[PDB]
Amino acid sequence: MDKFRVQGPTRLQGEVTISGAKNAALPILFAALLAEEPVEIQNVPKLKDIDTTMKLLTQLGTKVERXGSVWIDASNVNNFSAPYDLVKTMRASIWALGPLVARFGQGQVSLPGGCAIGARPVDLHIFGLEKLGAEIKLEEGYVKASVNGRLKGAHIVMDKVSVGATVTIMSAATLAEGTTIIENAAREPEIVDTANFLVALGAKISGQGTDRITIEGVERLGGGVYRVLPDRIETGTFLVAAAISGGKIVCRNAQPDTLDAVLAKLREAGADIETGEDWISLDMHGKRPKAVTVRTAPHPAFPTDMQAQFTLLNLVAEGTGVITETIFENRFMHVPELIRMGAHAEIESNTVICHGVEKLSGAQVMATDLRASASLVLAGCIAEGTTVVDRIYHIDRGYERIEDKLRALGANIERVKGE
Ligand SMILES: O=c1ccn([C@@H]2O[C@H](COP(=O)(O)OP(=O)(O)O[C@H]3O[C@H](CO)[C@@H](O)[C@H](O)[C@H]3O)[C@@H](O)[C@H]2O)c(=O)[nH]1
């Protein structure tokens, strides 16, 4: 069981190159199923889900190969079933459904736990496709979709805002007969990225990033080259790394506009921030951060995915600061770990009351959540002495070589093999 052994305190400073967003790479890889011509997807991170997706794609008849890019040739897709063995470890698997039925008139995806259980978590996907005129069958442990001829454009109103369902509907709609409108579409930068990809292939889409996406169906999608946008949350994690350690950092291969709220919040903490077309710089001028008030909310507001990171910030800042989860529930389970590190905080309802301390103390800690976990690693970096963060595999699933990146920033870090 891999562990991160950290020796603190160390100031985090210098430069880091932000990886492509896993969450944009995924829906794009699936949307590639629509492409009749070869496609090159650039800036794709080397992460478990990407490997799983590649294997899934190959099984369908797609020719796949990777390095920094992933090369895809779906001209020959001829198997329209995503099997149990290939989908099991991954929710994103459902994204194969829409493109298959949209392009091929048929497709199916295995539902772990069977139909009764597995159909529930993907109801919005099913709803969307139905709206598009597909016949959905729940049988033999699968969710099946078929349509005679092309899908049919539709006016679709979402009762729940969903990144997953928005991608399914938008992707499928690009091949539909007519106009499709998605009301209450997810606003995520990842959605914007997937829409842009689609358009690069020849799709007609507008409104991506807003509450309303309008798609005009076309007969076929071609091929081309497309670069996946930067990981906004990874970016935020590094900015915070410097912000809590008195450091200066420059984030390369970044996209400032996906981070409005985070940058604003960092400014409130006293950070000196500068931005360019593809970079972001943060300078604490050797100063401690100032406590901030944080309210997580739907994009483009403050991201819940940045919560743990800012909670940590508050824990070592000058003053008291409160972080409120306005939508999410039971998001503070990692706080007790920080307290064990010498932090002062109270969990109240949907909030955490942070009383900043000058310095943390090394300890043996662990969190199940990916974000909470990386936060523990940052904490170790600035704490006094030795910290051991257990179960880092969680981090490995969403961070591309965080140890290398941290070390290049001055961290004293070591990956330990089963303690
Ligand atoms: O078929 C579906 C799909 C989603 N939901 C629900 O609607 C919400 C929307 O899901 P979705 O947007 O697709 O969430 P995730 O895909 O798990 O995660 C993305 O969407 C979240 C907001 O929902 C953001 O907080 C994350 O940062 C972002 O990565 C979920 O809580 C689900 O409970 C359904 O009931 N049926």
Short mmCIF file of C-alpha atoms in Angstrom, two decimals, residues 11 242-247 266 268-271 283-291 313-320 355-360 382:
data_model
loop_
_atom_site.label_atom_id
_atom_site.label_comp_id
_atom_site.label_asym_id
_atom_site.label_seq_id
_atom_site.Cartn_x
_atom_site.Cartn_y
_atom_site.Cartn_z
CA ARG A 11 8.33 26.36 1.07
CA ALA A 242 2.34 28.22 -2.79
CA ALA A 243 -0.35 30.20 -1.00
CA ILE A 244 -0.01 28.26 2.25
CA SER A 245 3.81 28.15 2.23
CA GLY A 246 4.75 31.78 1.60
CA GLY A 247 5.82 30.78 -1.87
CA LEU A 266 -6.77 33.68 -3.37
CA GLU A 268 -8.84 37.70 -0.61
CA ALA A 269 -6.24 35.57 1.19
CA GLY A 270 -3.64 38.20 0.30
CA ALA A 271 -2.07 36.57 -2.75
CA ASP A 283 3.27 35.24 -5.03
CA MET A 284 2.79 35.32 -1.26
CA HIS A 285 5.84 37.57 -0.79
CA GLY A 286 6.84 35.30 2.08
CA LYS A 287 3.61 36.15 3.89
CA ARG A 288 1.13 33.93 5.79
CA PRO A 289 -2.30 33.72 4.15
CA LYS A 290 -5.22 35.74 5.54
CA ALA A 291 -8.31 33.74 6.57
CA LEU A 313 -5.42 27.29 3.76
CA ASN A 314 -7.72 28.60 6.49
CA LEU A 315 -6.13 26.22 9.00
CA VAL A 316 -2.71 27.89 8.62
CA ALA A 317 -3.97 31.44 7.92
CA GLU A 318 -4.00 34.53 10.10
CA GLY A 319 -7.48 34.68 11.60
CA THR A 320 -10.74 32.72 11.60
CA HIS A 355 -9.01 29.06 13.48
CA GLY A 356 -5.63 29.48 11.80
CA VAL A 357 -2.50 28.33 13.59
CA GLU A 358 1.06 29.38 12.72
CA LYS A 359 2.36 25.87 12.30
CA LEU A 360 1.17 22.27 11.82
CA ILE A 382 4.37 22.66 5.56
#
